[PDB]
C-alpha cells in the first residue's frame, strides 16, 4: 500500500498530471457546519494515495484547491453529496466536474438496495475494504497507520469502479441521465449547505 | 368567451404563441403516466387567456404544441413540472426544455411554510382564487363541461405572474443560480420517473 | 311508500325478481362475521325500488333470497362485495355467485382518485346524494326506524346504474377481462376471510 | 447436478413430454418494465434443469412459449406473481394454468410467516439451497458455473414441493380455494404490469 | 337549582344516597394520578340530580363519599372507570367496588363502532347532548363557574340510564358474564396503573 | 427424560393425584378457529410428562377434561391466554383455576422485556430448553422423538417456575394483583374466541 | 395609533423601557436560523403597547434593543423562547438573559392539556383572542401591512399578563424552582440548536 | 479488582477524601417509583470500588448522603439522569454538582450514535467491560462475585473517561455548554420523578 502522508496540503501536483482524481474525506461527523474537515484522501488512480491531515481552523489548501477547480479534471467520489459540501465549506471552492460511484451504482445495480463502497468493491472488483466506521476521532493530533490505510482504501479503487460503472451505464442505456445527475450534484451539495439537507427539492 | 379557447387535438396555429415563455399544465386519468393517458393540455401565452386542448385516446402527435415544447428559445413554465414533463414526453416523444417550475421556486423562496400548492401560491402571491387539484373528474370523458374548461384554464392563467414574483424573490434571497440548476435537471428527473425511479430520490445516501 | 318494501325474514315471493341482476347489501352488528350477526338484507331489482328484510337473531334460512343467491343466471351486484359475500355465506350457507363489485370496478376505472366509497361514486357518476356508511345504528334493534329503512334502501337503489357506467368505463379503458377475473375470484376471497385470512393479502410476496 | 445450458430458447421439446414444468427467472431487478429478463430456468421434474440465457432485446422464444401456452401443462412456480409478469412482458404470452408453491405454503404452513423457497425446501424435503441473493448482475455476457447451479436449484425441487403441498391442502381442506388463487394469479400479474403492482385490488 | 348541588370537601350526609347504585366521575389536574391531584368528585343517585364536590389541595379524607365507595352493596357506575378508580384510591385510600363501567359495556355491545366516548353514547343511546371531555379547565381553580358545575354534573346525570340500556344489550348479545368478569378485574387494572404498569397491557403476549 | 406418549387422551388419572398440573399445547398456528389442536402436553410436576396426540376432528378427551374442570387443581401455563382458548375451543371446558408464569414474570422481572419460557427457565432455574419454533407441522401423522422431547420440555419446569415466581410476588408485594389477573385470564381467553383477540378491552 | 409604534432597525431610545421585564417575539423567513434571516423584532414593556421593528437584510447591529437583551436586571419574556433566543443571538451576537418562557411555564402548570400554543393560552388564561402562528407572510417584504403590524404586536401585548398568571400557578402547584432552572438552561438549549443539535434532545438516554 | 463490599452504607469516608466520586446504581428496573434501589456502587477514582447492598425499605445512608450533599465533590455518572432520580427518591437528597459522561460523549463524539458505557470505555481507554444486562434480579438476598465485579466495573473508569471528555470538550469549544447541561441535569431528574419522565420539557 503506497501511501504518502501530508500536513495541510499536497506539496505539489507532480503526481496529479491526470484527467481524473479520486477523493474522499474524514470529518468529525455528518453535519458540515458543526463537524470540521479532518482528512482529505486523494488518489491519481495509479494504485497510490495521498492522505492529508487538515488542521483545526485551516482555511486554505492551494494545491488541492487547484485540482478541485480544474474543469479538465473529473473529481470521482463515492460519498459525493457529502464530500462536495465538506470541501466547499472548508476551502470555498465547489469541485466540478464530478462522477459519483454511488449514483452510478443506483442507476446500474438495479437488483439490490446495497450501494455502499465495501459492497461495490467486492462485487465489481473482488476487492475487500472496511465499511465506514464510527470508532475514529479523526480530529486526533496523531493518526495511526491503521487510520491512514483505512483512509487510503476509500480512494484507491474509485477509478476502477468508475470504469466498470461506465460500461454498465452504456450497456443499460443510462449514460446521459447519469451525466445530468453528476452535473446537478454540486448544486445538491450547495442546497445542503444552504439549509435543505433534509429535503428532496424535487418532491411533490 | 375570449378568455378560454377550446380545441381538439392540437393548437390550430401558433399566432398566439410568438412569445418567450408559455405556461403549461395537463389533465390525465391519474398519476401513473404508463397507465393513465394524457387527456387535456392547457396552455397560456401569459396574456390572461388560455387554450384548452382535448387529447384523444391513442393520440401520438400534436405538431404545433410540440414545436413549442422543442423550441429552446421558449421557456416552458409549470407548477406541476416533474409530473407534466413526464406526461408530455410519454405522449408525444419530446422532453420539453428549457423549463421554470413555480413549485421548486416556491420551495426555494417561501421558506416559512410547507404549503407549496398552486391554490396557496395564487392566493398568497397574487390574491387570486382558484380551486385546489380535484379528484372528481374523469378527464377522458367524451364531453368536457364549461366548469372543467374553467378549472383547466385556471391552472395556466397565472403561472407567468407567479414566475415574475418568484424570480424577484430568488434574486432577493440569493438563490437564482441554484434554482436554475434545479430547472436544468428537472427534465432528467422526469425521465428517471418514466424509466422506473418514480419512487426513489436518486440523491439519497 | 312504493319505493321501499319492508319484510320480516325473507322476500315473500320472487314476483319482483324475474331479472338478470340484483343489487344487494347488508347491515350487521359490525365487521367481524363470526361475532357480529346479520341484521338486514337489502335488495333491489334495479327498477328504483328496494326490499329491506329484517333478519332475526339465530336465523339460518331465507329460502327465497337464497334462490336468488344460488341462481347462476342472476348476477349479484354489490359495492361492499368482499364483506357482504362473507356475511351472506355465513348466515345461510350459500356463497353467492356470479357477482359484480362496483368498488373493484371503481378501482379499475377511477384511476385519478383514492376515494372509492359508495357515497362518492353515487355523487360523481350519477349526481345522486346518499349518506356515507355510518357507525350510529344498532341494526339488531327490535324496531328499525323509517330513516334506517331509507338508509338501507339507498345502498342498493343505485347499484345497477353504477354498474352500467362502470362497465362502459372498463370497456373504454381496456380492463373488462381483468375485472371479470376479479369478480370470479371474489367469492374465494370472502371464503378465505371466513377461514381465517381476513387480515392477509394472499398474493403478497 | 444435470444442467443443460442454452442460448435464447430450448432447442426442442424432447425433454418436455410432461404434464407439468417448473419455472423461475433471473432479471436485472424487481421492476419488469425497467429490468429485463436475463435467464429462464426450467425443469421437467426429473432431476434435470435447463438454464436459458436471454439476450438484451430478445423478443421471441418459440419452444419455451409453446410450453407456456400449452393448457395441458401446469406451470409450477415459487415466485409466481413475479415470474408470470416477467415472462408475459418478455414474450407476449401469459402462462397458464399455474401452481404457486408460495401461495400453497401460505395456505398450509399456518404456523409460520416464513414462506421462502429455501425454507420450504429444507422443511418439506430436507433439501438445502441458497436463498435469493442480490449479488449477481444477471445481464453479464458470461454466466458462471455457480450462477448456473444457483439458477437450476430454483427449479429442481418445485415438482416435489407441489406434491407435498397438494397433500397438505387436501388434509386441511383448502384445495378448492388454492385452485381459485391459481386461476386468478395470471390476472394478478397482468394487473401488476398494468400499473397496480403496489395495490391489493381486494382491499377495502 | 335543584338539579345540581354544590359542596365543599364531602357530601354533607347520605340522605340522597340510600340507593343500590351511584354514578361517579372526577375532575383532576390531568391524566397522571401521582402528579395531578383530585379536584372535583361528581356523583348522582340516578334520580336526575347530581352532587358536585370541590376537593381541596392535600385533602386526604372524605368520609361520607368513602362510605359509599366501600359499601359492597352499592355498585359504583363509571364511564371513565379505569382512570377514576385510580384517582379515588390514590386520594382517599379505598379502592371502590363493586363497579360497572359503561365504556367497557359499550365495547362489548356496540360492536359496529370504534367510538365509545361518553358524548357519543349519550347521544346514540339516550338522545342526550353533553360536551365531550375538554382540555380547557384548570379544575384546581379557587372558583368553579356555573358552566363548570354543569359540565361536571352532565358526566354523572346519565350513567344509570346508560347502564340500563347496556345491561339489556349485554343480555341480548350473550356477554353478561364476560362483562361482569371485566368489572371484577377493573379495580386491579387501576391498582396496576398506580403501581407502575399504566402503559402496559398485562395480558399481552 | 421420562415421557409417556398417548393417543387422544390420558388413559387414567393414576399420575394426576396432585393439586396442580402443568399444561401446554401444539397447534397448526396462532388462530384457534383456523388452526386445530394437535398435541396436549401435561406434567404432574414430578419430572415426567405426558404427550397426547390429538386427532383431526377430535371432540372429546374425558380424562384430560376432568383435570381441566377440577377446581381443586391449579392449571399452570406459560402460554396461558393462548392455551386456554385452544383447550376451550377443542373440548368445551374453559380450564380454571390457573396460574400463568408469563404474567407472573411480567409482575416480578421488572428489569427486562424478555418474558419467554426459554429465558425464564435459564434465569430462574439454570435449565436450558428450546425457544418456541416455527418449523414443525404438528398435524403430522407421526411425531418424532425430537418433537416429543420439545413438547415435554415445555411442561417439565412450570411447577418449579411457579414456586420461584410466587416467592418473588410475595417479596415485591404483588400476590393479590397476580391472583386477580389469574382469575380474569379465562375471560380474557373467552373474549379472544368471541372476536376480541386483537383488542385490549381495558384500553381507553 | 398609540397601541403600536413602528420603527426601522432599532428602538429610537429606551424611554418606554425603564422596566424590570420586557416581552419579545420575532418574525423571520422560516424556522432555520442559519438560512432564514431575522425580519421583525416585536417588543412590549407590558403597558398594553408594543414596538414593531423592521430589521433589514444583513443588519448586524441594533444597539438599543441589544442593551435590553444584555441587561441582567431585565427579564426577557417569550412564548417562543427556544427559537427567538437562537434568532436574536445569531442576528446581533448577544444571547439574551435572564428569561421567562410562557410555553415552558404552561407545560409545567397546564398539566391537563397537550395544547400549549400562544393563541390557546391567551384565550384560556386571559379571554384574549389572537391569531395562531400563520404561514402566509413573507416577513422580508419591503412593506409590512397594518394587519401584519397588528399580528406581530399581538404576540407580545399579553406576555406580561400570561407570566403573572403562570407564576401564580407555578407557586400553587409547587414547581417554581424547577421552572427557574429550565429558564436558566434555555439560553444554552438555544446555543446548542445553533451549534448543530437542533433536532436532538441532549438529555435523551 | 479491589472491591469492598458493604451492607446499607459506607462505614466511614476514609477512602473519600477526594474532589470527585464515580457513582452508579442497580435497581429492579427503569421506573424509580416502582423499582427499588438495590445497589449503590462508588469509586474514589483510585482503581478501587465500594459496592453497597441496599435493603428493601431502607430510608437512610448517612455517609453516602454526605458525599451526595457535599458541593465541593463532583459526582460523576454515566447514567446520570436515571441514577440521580433513583438516589434522590431513595434517600431524599438530589446529588450536586455532577458530571455526566454520556452527555459529554454526545457533545464530543459527534461521529457516532453509540454513547454507551461499554463503547466509550473501549474507544477512549481500550478498557473492556460488559454492556448493561437484563439478567440480574438485583434484589436477591445474596449477590454473586460476578455481580459485584459487574457493578464495580461501572464506576472504576468514570474518572478517566471524564478526564478524556474534558479535553475533547475544550478542544471542540463546548465546555461551557456541557457545564450548563450538568447544572440542569438534577432538575431534569427531578422533573422525571415529578411526572415528566417521557416528555422533553424543551420541545415545541
Author numbering:
A (entry chain A), D (entry chain A), F (entry chain A), H (entry chain A): 1 to 204
B (entry chain B), C (entry chain B), E (entry chain B), G (entry chain B): 0 to 204
Provide the authors' original text about this structure.
(C) Superposition of four apo-NrnCBm conformations based on three independent crystal forms (comprising chains apo1A/apo1B for form 1; apo2A/apo2B for form 2, and apo3A/pGG-bound3B for form 3), compared to the pGG-bound conformation of the same protein shown in (B). In a second apo-NrnCBm crystal form, we captured an alternate conformation in which the conserved hydrophobic residue F79 moves into the active site. The movement of this residue, which is adjacent to the phosphate cap residue H78, is realized through a flip of the peptide backbone and would introduce a clash with the nucleotide. In the same structure, the flexible SKQQQS loop is collapsed into the active site, trapping the catalytic residue Y150 in an intermediate conformation, which would introduce further clashes with the nucleotide substrate.
Orn and NrnC are 3′–5′ exonucleases with a DnaQ fold containing the catalytic DEDD motif, a domain that is common in enzymes that act on nucleic acids. Notably, Orn (and its eukaryotic ortholog REXO2) or NrnC activity is critical for cellular growth, rendering them unique amongst the exoribonucleases known to date. Through quantitative structure-function analyses, we show here that NrnC-type RNases share this narrow substrate length preference with Orn. The structures confirm an octameric assembly as a conserved feature of NrnC-type RNases.
